[PDB]
Amino acid sequence: IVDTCSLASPASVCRTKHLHLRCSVDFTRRTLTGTAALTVQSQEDNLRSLVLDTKDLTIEKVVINGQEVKYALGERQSYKGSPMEISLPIALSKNQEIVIEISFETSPKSSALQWLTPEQTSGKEHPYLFSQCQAIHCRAILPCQDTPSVKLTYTAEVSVPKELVALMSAIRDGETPDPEDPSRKIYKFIQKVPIPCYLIALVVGALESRQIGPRTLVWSEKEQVEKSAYEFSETESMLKIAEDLGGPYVWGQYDLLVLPPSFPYGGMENPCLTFVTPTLLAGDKSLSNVIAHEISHSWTGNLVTNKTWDHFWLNEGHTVYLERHICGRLFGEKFRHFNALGGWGELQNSVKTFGETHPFTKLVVDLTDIDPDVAYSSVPYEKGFALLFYLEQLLGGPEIFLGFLKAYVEKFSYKSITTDDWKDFLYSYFKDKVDVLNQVDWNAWLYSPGLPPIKPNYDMTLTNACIALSQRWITAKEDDLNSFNATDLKDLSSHQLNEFLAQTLQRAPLPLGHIKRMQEVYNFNAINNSEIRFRWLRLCIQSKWEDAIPLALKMATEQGRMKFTRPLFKDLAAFDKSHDQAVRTYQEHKASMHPVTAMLVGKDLKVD
Ligand SMILES: Nc1nc(-c2ccc(Cc3ccccc3)cc2)cs1
Numbered sequence: 001i002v003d004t005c006s007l008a009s010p011a012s013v014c015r016t017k018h019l020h021l022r023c024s025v026d027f028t029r030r031t032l033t034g035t036a037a038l039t040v041q042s043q044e045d046n047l048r049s050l051v052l053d054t055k056d057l058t059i060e061k062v063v064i065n066g067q068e069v070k071y072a073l074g075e076r077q078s079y080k081g082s083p084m085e086i087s088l089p090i091a092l093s094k095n096q097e098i099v100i101e102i103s104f105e106t107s108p109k110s111s112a113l114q115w116l117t118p119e120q121t122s123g124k125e126h127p128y129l130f131s132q133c134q135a136i137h138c139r140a141i142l143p144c145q146d147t148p149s150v151k152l153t154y155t156a157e158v159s160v161p162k163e164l165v166a167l168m169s170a171i172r173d174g175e176t177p178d179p180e181d182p183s184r185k186i187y188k189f190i191q192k193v194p195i196p197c198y199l200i201a202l203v204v205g206a207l208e209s210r211q212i213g214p215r216t217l218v219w220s221e222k223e224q225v226e227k228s229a230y231e232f233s234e235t236e237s238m239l240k241i242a243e244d245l246g247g248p249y250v251w252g253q254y255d256l257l258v259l260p261p262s263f264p265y266g267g268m269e270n271p272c273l274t275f276v277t278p279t280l281l282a283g284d285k286s287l288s289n290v291i292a293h294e295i296s297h298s299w300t301g302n303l304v305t306n307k308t309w310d311h312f313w314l315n316e317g318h319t320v321y322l323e324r325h326i327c328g329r330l331f332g333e334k335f336r337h338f339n340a341l342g343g344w345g346e347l348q349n350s351v352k353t354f355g356e357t358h359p360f361t362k363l364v365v366d367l368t369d370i371d372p373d374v375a376y377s378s379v380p381y382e383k384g385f386a387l388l389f390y391l392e393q394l395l396g397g398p399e400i401f402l403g404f405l406k407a408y409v410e411k412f413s414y415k416s417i418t419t420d421d422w423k424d425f426l427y428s429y430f431k432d433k434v435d436v437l438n439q440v441d442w443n444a445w446l447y448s449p450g451l452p453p454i455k456p457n458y459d460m461t462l463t464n465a466c467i468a469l470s471q472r473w474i475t476a477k478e479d480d481l482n483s484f485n486a487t488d489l490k491d492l493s494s495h496q497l498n499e500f501l502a503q504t505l506q507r508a509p510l511p512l513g514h515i516k517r518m519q520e521v522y523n524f525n526a527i528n529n530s531e532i533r534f535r536w537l538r539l540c541i542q543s544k545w546e547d548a549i550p551l552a553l554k555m556a557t558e559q560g561r562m563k564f565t566r567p568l569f570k571d572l573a574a575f576d577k578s579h580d581q582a583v584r585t586y587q588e589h590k591a592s593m594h595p596v597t598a599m600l601v602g603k604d605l606k607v608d
């Protein structure tokens, strides 16, 4: 097993046990400056040097046992960054530990970070910083073994402008004035559970908090706090169900932080402090599956971890599985099946997009010379979910399968594993059903591109109305348009309306008169739910309605969640009437976008 995304010494050579980070956030220079003290344990006899990951870091010195030591930065290897070799002052025996203190400064163009000016924030008076380390961006903040095969604890002390607040993926451990500068404050943090370094996270801004359950505060700028608190009020209930399914929650606190609109993801499962998009703020709790997902990662991903990024489906497929069980416990089994079948839809769309032979449609991927950000998609989520949901049905149902899941989490808690570790444990647990397991086409499911070789069984109860209405619009001729009316939607939930649009978007384009009639009768232009609006606006642009152009450009640029921004820009580039405006809008906004999203939209548009 090789981590082909890391340049560092592997876990077979040495392992980081602990990080003590001391740093200062400088908004004038857009740099984090500090010292990273790594406690490293040798796994070999006679260890005399090691190699760390870095990306666009300035190294001031390396100190061991109170003296400076020699080190060298290797040449840059594109998105992997530059290997940093450190010469140890004394040779280590196996299991010996030493502390290496590295003084460093980040680049303003750090791939991990977005720096926001006051005008980019809600409140308009203070700047803002946030990090996004997954997959391999920790190395763009601090030198490390930037591989999920290594887990460490951490403590940190962060100096900020005293008007601001810092938070991390860790338990808050107090705040004091910075004794070396009275315009600044030092915020302290402790992470006592070992974690892969991708889970390190930092935010600095004008943040306020509100308590929403016994172990949860929501944090955001003042303007978003009230709405956040209502939107995520199911959090404690979801935590209780997740503890039922996965075992104890070991992390102490489960806080939420609602980021600025440019956050690239729906959520990031940073331990103690999940980060979420403000595009979840629909006003009705309807997008709370994203919370159920991130909660679930407190078991699958954060406790049991993929050993390399080629086995990312372990993290994500299992988390989707748990997510859908949480939402199933809250709203019913028929709803679990509705969401499962929607996810198969998403998988169809991914596979169609990539093409059925594309190597990024395999469940287990080979990321040798591939930037993980470029590979990222819903495939590991939904092909991974599909595998588990197939297996559930093959092995005697959800209760039985959930017994496996809990046992799996107990077995591999605090470790990092591969697909073969998972499959061996599946065969062991289900030793009395090996004959059923040997019916699975494991080679196709794990290692072949395209749609999986078997589709699970799905209850259709809540899906049927969606399909029916979609088919009415698809088969409608001009003389049928008058028959449609706002009453068509009266018995559809918001999740059903979203699925009606998803079904219809799969058949897009529709005739432009159909799309005009849909606005006339349903007033989808008025709906602010981000999922619904995204789909509706894709429908409109693919169906070549020029009126939708400014609406889609607005949604593409006023938020940055990659799931919405990337396909809106690609649709707008594909419509000749909006093509030049899409490229120009991207160019104008690029410097103020998140660095990952900017890179990806530029790739998508063939721009730069
Ligand atoms: N089609 C498939 N893709 C993957 C996969 C996709 C992306 C990654 C890397 C990654 C993981 C998480 C955030 C950004 C990048 C690793 C694996 C796994 S199965």
Ligand SMILES: O=C(CCC(=O)N1CCC[C@H]1C(=O)O)[C@@H]1CCCN1
Residues within 6 Å of the ligand: 134, 264, 265, 266, 267, 268, 269, 316, 377, 378, 381, 561, 562, 563
């Ligand atoms: O799984 C999650 C969150 C999932 C996420 O943000 N998704 C899923 C596909 C679309 C995107 C989104 O919801 O915007 C993170 C990504 C880094 C690792 N865990």
Ligand SMILES: [Yb+3]
Residues within 6 Å of the ligand: 045, 046, 093
């Ligand atoms: Yb020795």
Ligand SMILES: [Yb+3]
Residues within 6 Å of the ligand: 477, 479, 480
């Ligand atoms: Yb007709």
Ligand SMILES: [Zn+2]
Residues within 6 Å of the ligand: 293, 297, 315, 316, 319
């Ligand atoms: Zn996830």
